[PDB]
Amino acid sequence: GPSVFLFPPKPKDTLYITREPEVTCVVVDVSHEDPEVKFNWYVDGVEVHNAKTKPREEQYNSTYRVVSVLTVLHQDWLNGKEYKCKVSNKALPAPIEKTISKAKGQPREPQVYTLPPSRDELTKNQVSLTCLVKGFYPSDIAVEWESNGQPENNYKTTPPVLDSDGSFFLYSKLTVDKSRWQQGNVFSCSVMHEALKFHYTQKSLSLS
Amino acid sequence: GGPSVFLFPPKPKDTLYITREPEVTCVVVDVSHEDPEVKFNWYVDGVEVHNAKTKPREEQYNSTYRVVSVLTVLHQDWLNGKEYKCKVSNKALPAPIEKTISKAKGQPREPQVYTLPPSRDELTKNQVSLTCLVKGFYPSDIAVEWESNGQPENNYKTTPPVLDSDGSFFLYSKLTVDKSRWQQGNVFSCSVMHEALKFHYTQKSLSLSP
Amino acid sequence: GPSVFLFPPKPKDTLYITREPEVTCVVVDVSHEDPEVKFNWYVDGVEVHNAKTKPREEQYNSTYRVVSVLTVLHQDWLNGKEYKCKVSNKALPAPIEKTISKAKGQPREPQVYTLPPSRDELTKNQVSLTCLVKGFYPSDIAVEWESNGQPENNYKTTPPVLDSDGSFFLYSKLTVDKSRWQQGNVFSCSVMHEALKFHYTQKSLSLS
Numbered sequence: 012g013p014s015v016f017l018f019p020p021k022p023k024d025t026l027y028i029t030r031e032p033e034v035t036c037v038v039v040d041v042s043h044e045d046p047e048v049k050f051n052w053y054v055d056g057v058e059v060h061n062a063k064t065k066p067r068e069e070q071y072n073s074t075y076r077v078v079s080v081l082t083v084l085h086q087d088w089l090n091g092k093e094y095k096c097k098v099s100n101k102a103l104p105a106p107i108e109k110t111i112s113k114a115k116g117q118p119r120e121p122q123v124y125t126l127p128p129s130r131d132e133l134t135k136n137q138v139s140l141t142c143l144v145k146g147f148y149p150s151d152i153a154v155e156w157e158s159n160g161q162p163e164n165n166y167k168t169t170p171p172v173l174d175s176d177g178s179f180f181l182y183s184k185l186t187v188d189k190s191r192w193q194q195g196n197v198f199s200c201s202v203m204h205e206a207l208k209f210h211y212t213q214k215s216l217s218l219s
Numbered sequence: 220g221g222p223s224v225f226l227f228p229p230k231p232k233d234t235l236y237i238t239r240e241p242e243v244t245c246v247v248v249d250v251s252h253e254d255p256e257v258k259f260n261w262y263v264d265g266v267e268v269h270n271a272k273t274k275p276r277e278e279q280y281n282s283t284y285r286v287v288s289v290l291t292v293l294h295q296d297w298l299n300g301k302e303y304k305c306k307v308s309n310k311a312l313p314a315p316i317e318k319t320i321s322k323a324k325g326q327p328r329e330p331q332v333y334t335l336p337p338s339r340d341e342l343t344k345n346q347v348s349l350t351c352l353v354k355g356f357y358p359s360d361i362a363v364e365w366e367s368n369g370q371p372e373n374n375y376k377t378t379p380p381v382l383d384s385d386g387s388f389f390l391y392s393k394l395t396v397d398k399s400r401w402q403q404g405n406v407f408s409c410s411v412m413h414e415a416l417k418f419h420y421t422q423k424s425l426s427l428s429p
Numbered sequence: 430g431p432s433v434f435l436f437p438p439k440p441k442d443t444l445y446i447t448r449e450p451e452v453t454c455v456v457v458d459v460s461h462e463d464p465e466v467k468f469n470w471y472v473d474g475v476e477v478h479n480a481k482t483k484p485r486e487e488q489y490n491s492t493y494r495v496v497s498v499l500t501v502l503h504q505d506w507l508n509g510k511e512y513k514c515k516v517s518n519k520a521l522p523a524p525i526e527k528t529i530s531k532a533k534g535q536p537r538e539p540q541v542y543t544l545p546p547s548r549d550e551l552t553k554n555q556v557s558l559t560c561l562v563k564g565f566y567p568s569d570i571a572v573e574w575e576s577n578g579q580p581e582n583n584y585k586t587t588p589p590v591l592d593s594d595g596s597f598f599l600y601s602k603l604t605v606d607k608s609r610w611q612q613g614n615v616f617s618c619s620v621m622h623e624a625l626k627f628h629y630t631q632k633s634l635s636l637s
């Protein structure tokens with residue numbers, strides 16, 4: 012301390028005109044002895060002044076947390092612009108600098124595959140519906156589930172995992188009551204990624 | 220300023236296999252060139268032990284040393300929750316640094332293992348994905364491998380454990396095989412080792428269905 | 430003078446990770462005049478200090494028995510490490526050293542075969558399920574039975590028998606109610622051995 016963490020936008024914030032992507036600069040372990048924090052922001056090395064800095068917030072471990080948020084243009088993030096947060100504090104020998112950008116490398120479109128429950132799981136009261144998303148680059152991605160136009164919320168999805176060919180994959184597991192699966196209800200896995208056309212794709216799954 | 224200590228647990232394949240040696244690893248970084256010697260004292264449930272293995276120091280790029288001591292733990296001791304303490308002494312430290320490590324606490328829960336064949340739409344590709352779903356296990360320490368007709372198979376990747384809504388963990392392991400190997404009827408096996416299994420091992424097989 | 434006997438661990442203590450294998454150094458004929466006994470222990474020539482010495486026990490013939498117990502690492506015993514107990518006593522002209530190790534020789538993987546009851550045994554209220562385990566080396570092995578994820582405890586296993594080719598074989602007999610066998614219940618013979626892949630294999634048996 013003080014230490015700085017620079018966070019990227021959320022994957023869905025970059026992909027839809029609907030949402031506002033922005034980069035977040037977090038300073039932790041600010042001592043009560045040195046409460047002042049100054050933020051300077053750079054986009055491709057050019058100083059910018061539109062960042063919104065919040066007032067310091069006291070933490071339970073008797074240190075301050077200070078957050079500055081820079082609202083980022085959609086196309087700028089996807090085109091690989093560089094965002095640098097410069098953090099100044101009197102307890103620092105020199106200011107702390109962090110830089111973030113989207114991963115470089117040619118984007119690769121995710122391949123989406125839905126997998127029904129394993130035969131041995133059909134014995135249980137609730138079954139697992141699986142969505143395999145593989146071969147995508149970069150790793151920023153979002154996955155959701157629906158049934159009959161309505162969102163399904165009983166799902167958990169793994170973080171991206173680096174594959175042997177340089178792309179990423181993950182799995183999403185949706186849990187439903189077995190009865191819903193044998194009624195023949197249709198379930199859909201939704202994937203959001205910059206390499207998809209219109210940044211969206213869908214794959215459905217139902218009893219065969 | 221000063222050396223820092225990091226204490227690492229044994230790995231789940233070392234702990235669960237009788238022929239391997241599970242080890243607790245005590246790592247000291249930021250060891251200076253002027254005072255490079257590090258003395259390690261090890262304790263199991265507070266009693267000093269003397270079987271630790273000293274590794275050769277390794278010079279780092281920022282002109283400091285990394286110094287490591289490795290304690291082999293009894294298989295049954297680690298699984299019974301004994302506490303392992305590494306005490307690190309160095310002439311640049313005003314007082315020795317102590318770190319303690321133990322196995323994750325909580326009621327153990329047995330993994331459920333399910334194999335999933337490739338998606339119908341993936342069969343058009345030259346390579347297909349065999350999926351192993353491992354769920355409902357606690358703690359998260361687990362090992363997963365793949366075999367083919369009993370033989371080790373290595374083009375697989377396994378996700379990290381993910382916390383489920385009920386407090387247990389799950390993961391997926393993905394094996395990639397040539398379509399022709401799947402279409403020949405070869406049997407593929409997902410093998411998992413976990414402390415909550417009887418015999419600490421279980422396997423589920425998968426092959427082309429008629 | 431005193432005599433020393435060095436005993437190996439119990440074979441199943443080495444094959445189960447939750448069990449504790451130990452080598453035991455026993456000294457008998459320790460005199461009343463020279464009661465002091467010192468133990469030094471070595472693993473592959475390296476002295477170790479974790480041995481537990483028991484208190485002297487006076488015997489009926491007016492001599493002492495003194496025992497020291499060394500816990501061996503599972504992998505150390507199985508990898509063929511050599512254990513030396515060195516015993517010093519003032520009545521000995523020179524210390525007595527005893528060495529013990531696992532049987533050497535190429536490990537050979539067990540072949541596991543299940544055998545249903547003989548037709549003539551079906552007249553009885555209880556039947557014998559047989560597990561034949563053959564061709565294994567060394568003779569250290571463990572056999573258990575399960576049904577439907579649960580242990581079956583009504584079994585007995587023969588000791589290993591040396592076969593004509595230098596390997597060992599044994600038989601395990603599980604006794605079950607005939608009705609359980611005729612219901613189609615599946616029974617499994619589980620064996621643990623260092624030469625098996627994953628040190629484990631299982632063979633099932635049910636009404637044909």
Ligand SMILES: *[C@@H]1O[C@H](CO)[C@@H](O[C@@H]2O[C@H](CO)[C@@H](O[C@@H]3O[C@H](CO)[C@@H](O)[C@H](O[C@H]4O[C@H](CO)[C@@H](O)[C@H](O)[C@@H]4O[C@@H]4O[C@H](CO)[C@@H](O)[C@H](O)[C@H]4NC(C)=O)[C@@H]3O)[C@H](O)[C@H]2NC(C)=O)[C@H](O)[C@H]1NC(C)=O
Nearest residue numbers: 012014015016018037038039040070071072073074075076
């Ligand atoms: C007082 O209480 C506050 C609570 O607010 C604490 O603040 C917390 O401080 C934590 C650090 O002490 C923060 O933890 C970080 O959280 C990030 C979570 O996203 C995470 O990304 C960070 O992980 C990186 O840095 C770690 C080192 O600190 C590494 O262990 C880790 O592997 C990560 O390292 C990066 O790795 C990638 C590749 O994988 C590299 O590309 C990066 O360059 C690496 N980063 C580098 C080298 O810097 C870390 O876990 C936590 O966010 C924060 N909480 C909040 C709400 O802000 C104070 O610590 C606490 N202080 C005391 C004294 O109690």
Ligand SMILES: *[C@@H]1O[C@H](CO[C@@H]2O[C@@H](C)[C@@H](O)[C@@H](O)[C@@H]2O)[C@@H](O)[C@H](O)[C@H]1NC(C)=O
Nearest residue numbers: 223247248249278279280281282283284285
């Ligand atoms: C000094 O450098 C050590 C080396 O750590 C490794 O190498 C550097 C270059 C990075 O890649 C780092 O992420 C690696 O883990 C560090 O162990 C040590 O913390 C460093 N100490 C200081 C004070 O910088």
Ligand SMILES: *[C@@H]1O[C@H](CO[C@@H]2O[C@@H](C)[C@@H](O)[C@@H](O)[C@@H]2O)[C@@H](O)[C@H](O)[C@H]1NC(C)=O
Nearest residue numbers: 432456457458459488489490491492493494
């Ligand atoms: C003295 O006796 C020691 C103990 O004898 C053994 O244990 C007792 C409990 C009896 O069961 C006895 O029959 C056993 O043989 C022996 O270890 C030792 O050899 C004996 N020595 C002499 C000289 O008699």
